[PDB]
């Protein structure tokens, strides 16, 4: 059929792609440079989609095919087509190459591909077993070049079990895997393992253990930008739930900055929602461009209403906002922070008063913030002066809030500190760029 | 260019759509007279359904029959041109059919007919005229995508080849759309460019064009350009001599007569509320004009008591205090209020300090870009 | 014609006189300058405000007590303007490198 | 030096954004005149940074 022949052609092109990736893996192991395995994994997400039964059937018929347990393991889980007319024997290894065992990296890549296909087919149980087998056989291996594919397979195994709605049978095993990766000095594998452990804790609400792990473990600096963004989001949630609001805001802004341009909509949605909540708690009204964006508009609409209520200062509006979308906030895992905002709303008003006025009288500030009595205003203002929200100094002798006089920052040292940080970053970037330089062997 | 579609009809429809003026009588009579004279049956039905009016059975049937027989005559002429006359005759017949389709208010049919005429039209000038007709239709209906695509097409046609008159008309059309989209800077630029040789009398008379130009220029242009291009502009001054209110409003800001400026600004807000193009942006225009006036007053002062500025603006101390606090909270005015002593102190950054802030911001952006590039390439 | 041109001449004369009378002072109070020019306090205040707002003689008024402070208007430090322009140029060069590096 | 480096950065922008691929290896050899790309480039960066660093260290 026309559709069938088109599918066969796409399968053949995918087979050519996998052959190219396996050749790259072999060249990487020969040259001991991750670059090639990194590119193979980079192409992996694209190949994850656009795969049917015959695709992987032909891949297993051509690759491997040594009568090994893999063929008797995945094939019983994946159907087999009839005698295809275009029986092109996809055999990159010919004669001696076929006899030689498949390279550990290449075999791991093929097992990862089959596991991804099982994921996309919702064969949760079969992917379970195939992932255990591949993980066990990769655990024995100790080649450095295998570590990146090991990290990818680790992440996909955690994902398969996450769809298994258990995500606890993995806790100890991923802890052990991450610890071994840390011992081995691996970077990508330990990065993915730490991110996945943090994700599991955040799912099951074990915040304290996650904070302990983040405090003790150290994330390698030379990690993937996407992995860094995921870790930043997880650490931002940990900090925000733990009352380190400023650090949470900074970390989540960094995570948003490091997001993959336009590749992951959902991660951006969640980061924006949590950042909006944290910023509202910290006393800053968030930017409207986020709410106006096309992809994030409908997702953040309840947060837009919440920000409206907070800025306007109408506690009743906040209550009706919670009534309509309270369950949505809960399902988003931000209900507790929203309640904290409900009881901290006065911080935004105090911050606005601090920005506007410089010597506001206590009675007038109490009137403006709809407080009942001036003494409550004094209490709230002092609490704000600690909370990093205001920089004033109450003069209780005459009861007026005297904001600190602004000073010429340039004549002070802060510009030197900012320039030092930026110059250090620039010099480090230059050193890193000239450091690799990928000079070929003559 | 042809007056069809008549933007006055769209303005009247919007005015009736406004809550207060929904029951207006004179606008009702004007719109009904326009519909009857122009015989807009589809437009009449759409307006009746939208405004919940009582459809006149006799008038509606008469208009429908007139539209039907006119369309039949146009189709007969098109068939005659197709059979006997050449390509030019058929193109003109289809152009007339599309023109009458726009006459009655059939948006979809008129647009499709104009598209067919454009497809069958070879002359560049006629293609530009078709684009102008579609742009006028879009303005009448406020179809953002249609107006944007057709403006791009008209720009491409002019770039390939185009007379100066078409360029001026397209400049005025872009200015009107920009005013309707709230990009007041481009509106001011285009309108100030075209005010000298305003030849697009179909969209709006010259007095309305000068009023719009003054409004958008004051919302966009700064004081030096405002003086050089609006205050001393011969055309704008000549037109304003016939519009005392607009002249007073414009001169209040430049001459520093703030109470009269606020009176004129209230009048202008009321006028724009009814206007069909400035209606969505009237609140923003008034807010930005007030912010501009406050900043202009504060530019020459470092610490002015709230009482003095309240007297200057002809408003109470409490109102000016509240408005100044609101505008400071949004980071628009560079001042900090001192309620106990009632003194407003301007905190305008020194040139060195502002330059340091700008360099910090731009360098942070560039460093983020460089870090992303290094991460992407280093693998 | 006479009215408009004489009003403009009056404006020019007031500007010149005010500039002449503020040259020695640095923090002159508005009342003294008005007395020196023999004009109403409000008129001199308005003219000074307009002059400052129009990049005329440099200074800032303070209605809290009333003075016409005059300073020397630091130049601008052209070095920072050049640095900002170079930063913009390098940002667009980084954009170009973004256009490159697509070929891996 | 900063103004001349701004002009040189404009020139470097023009040279790089062009990135003419009509045998780029030949382009880099047909425009060799000790000009914008790096010669009048980071040479000036080194001059500026050496002078500024030495002056600041001496001042401290």
């Amino acid at each position: 059929a026309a559709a069938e022949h088109s599918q066969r052609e796409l399968d053949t092109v995918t087979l050519e792609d996998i052959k190219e990736h396996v050749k790259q893996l072999e060249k990487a192991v020969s040259g001991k440079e991750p670059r090639f395995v990194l590119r193979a994994l980079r192409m992996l997400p694209s190949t994850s989609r656009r795969l049917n039964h015959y695709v992987l059937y032909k891949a297993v018929q051509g690759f491997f095919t040594s009568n090994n347990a893999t063929r008797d393991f995945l094939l019983p889980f994946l159907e087999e087509p009839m005698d295809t007319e275009a029986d092109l024997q996809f055999r990159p290894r010919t004669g001696k190459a076929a006899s030689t065992p498949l390279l550990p990296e290449v075999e791991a890549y093929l097992q990862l591909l089959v596991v991804i296909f099982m994921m996309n087919s919702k064969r949760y149980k079969e992917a379970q077993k195939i992932s255990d087998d591949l993980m066990q056989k990769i655990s024995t291996q100790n080649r450095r070049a295998l570590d990146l594919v090991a990290a990818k397979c680790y992440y996909y195994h955690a994902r398969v079990y996450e769809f298994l709605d258990k995500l606890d049978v993995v806790r100890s095993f991923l802890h052990a895997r991450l610890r071994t990766a840390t011992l081995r000095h691996d970077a990508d594998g330990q990065a993915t393992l730490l991110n996945l452990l943090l994700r599991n804790y955040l799912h099951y609400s074990l915040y304290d253990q996650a904070e302990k792990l983040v405090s003790k473990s150290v994330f390698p600096e030379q990690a993937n930008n996407n992995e860094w963004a995921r870790y930043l989001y997880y650490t931002g949630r940990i900090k925000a739930i733990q009352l380190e609001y400023s650090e949470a805001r900074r970390t989540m802004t960094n995570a948003l900055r490091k997001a993959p341009q336009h590749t992951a909509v959902g991660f951006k949605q969640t980061v924006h929602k949590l950042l909006i909540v944290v910023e509202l708690l910290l006393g800053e009204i968030p930017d409207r461009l986020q709410f106006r964006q096309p992809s994030l508009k409908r997702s953040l609409m309840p947060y837009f209403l919440l920000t409206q209520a907070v800025r306007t200062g109408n506690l009743a509006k906040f209550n009706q906002v919670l009534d309509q979308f309270g369950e949505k906030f809960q399902a988003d895992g931000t209900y507790t922070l929203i309640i904290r905002l409900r009881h901290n709303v006065i911080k935004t008003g105090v911050r606005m008063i601090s920005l506007s006025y410089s010597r506001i009288s206590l009675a007038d500030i109490a009137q403006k913030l709809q407080l009942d009595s001036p003494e409550d205003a004094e209490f709230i203002v002092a609490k704000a002066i600690r909370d990093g929200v205001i920089e004033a100094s109450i003069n209780h002798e005459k009861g007026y809030v005297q904001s600190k006089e602004m000073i010429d920052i340039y004549s002070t040292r802060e510009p030197q500190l900012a320039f030092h940080q930026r110059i250090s970053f620039c010099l480090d970037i230059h050193n890193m760029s000239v450091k690799a330089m990928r000079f070929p062997p003559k | 260019l042809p007056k069809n579609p008549d933007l006055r009809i769209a303005q009247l429809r919007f005015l009736l759509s406004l809550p207060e003026h929904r029951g207006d009588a004179a606008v009702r009579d004007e719109l009904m007279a326009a519909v009857r004279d122009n015989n807009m049956a589809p437009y009449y039905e759409a307006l009746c359904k939208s405004l919940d009016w009582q459809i006149d059975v006799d008038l509606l049937n008469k208009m429908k029959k007139a539209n039907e027989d006119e369309l039949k005559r146009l189709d007969e002429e098109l068939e005659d041109a197709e059979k006997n006359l050449g390509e030019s005759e058929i193109r003109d017949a289809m152009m007339a059919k599309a023109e009458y389709l726009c006459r009655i208010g059939d948006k979809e049919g008129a647009l499709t007919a104009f598209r067919k005429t454009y497809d069958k039209t070879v002359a560049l000038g006629h293609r530009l005229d078709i684009v102008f007709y579609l742009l006028r239709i879009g303005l009448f209906y406020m179809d953002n995508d249609l107006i944007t695509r057709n403006t791009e097409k008209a720009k491409s046609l002019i770039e390939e080849g185009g007379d100066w008159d078409r360029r001026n008309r397209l400049k005025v059309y872009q200015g009107l759309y920009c005013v309707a989209i709230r990009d007041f800077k481009q509106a001011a630029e285009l309108f100030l460019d075209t005010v000298s040789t305003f030849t697009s009398y179909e969209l709006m008379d010259y007095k309305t064009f000068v009023t719009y130009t003054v409004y958008v220029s004051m919302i966009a242009l700064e004081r030096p350009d405002l003086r050089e291009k609006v205050i001393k502009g011969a055309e704008i001054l000549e037109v304003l001599h016939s519009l005392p209110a607009v002249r007073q409003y414009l001169f209040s800001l430049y001459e520093c007569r703030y109470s009269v400026f606020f009176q004129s600004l209230a009048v202008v807000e009321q006028e724009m509320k009814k206007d069909w193009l400035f209606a969505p942006h009237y609140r923003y225009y008034v807010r930005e004009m007030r912010i501009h006036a406050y900043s202009q007053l504060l530019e020459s002062y470092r610490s002015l008591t709230l009482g003095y500025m309240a007297e200057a603006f002809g408003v109470g101390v409490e109102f000016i205090d509240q408005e100044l606090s609101r505008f400071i909270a949004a980071g628009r005015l560079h001042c900090k209020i001192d309620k106990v002593n009632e003194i407003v102190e301007t905190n305008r950054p020194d040139s060195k300090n502002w330059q340091y802030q700008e360099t910090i911001k731009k360098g942070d952006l560039l460093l983020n870009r460089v870090q992303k590039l290094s991460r992407v390439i280093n693998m | 014609i006479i009215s408009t041109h004489l009003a403009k001449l009056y404006d020019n004369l007031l500007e010149q006189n005010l500039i002449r009378v503020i040259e020695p002072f640095s923090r002159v109070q508005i009342e003294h300058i008005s007395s020196l020019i023999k004009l109403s306090k409000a008129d001199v205040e308005r003219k000074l405000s307009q002059m400052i707002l129009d990049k005329k003689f440099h200074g800032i008024l303070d209605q809290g007590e009333g003075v016409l402070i005059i300073f020397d208007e630091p130049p601008v430090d052209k070095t920072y303007e050049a640095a900002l322009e170079t930063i913009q140029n390098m940002s667009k060069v980084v954009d170009s490198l973004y256009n490159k590096a697509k070929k891996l | 030096v900063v103004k001349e480096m701004l002009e040189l950065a404009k020139n470097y922008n023009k040279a790089v954004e062009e990135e003419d691929k009509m045998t780029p290896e030949q382009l880099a050899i047909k425009n060799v005149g000790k000009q914008d790309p790096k010669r009048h480039l980071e040479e000036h960066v080194d001059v500026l940074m050496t002078s500024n660093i030495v002056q600041c260290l001496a001042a401290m």
Partner: peptide, 30 residues
């Protein structure tokens, strides 16, 4: 700081050029 930014941009451009040269040589190898 401006000099450091210029140096970093130049180094990144040189790294991009060298990487593209190496990739082109490898591709033309086979």
């Amino acid at each position: 700081y401006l000099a450091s930014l210029i140096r970093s941009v130049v180094a990144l451009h040189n790294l991009i050029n060298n990487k593209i040269a190496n990739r082109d040589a490898e591709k033309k190898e086979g």
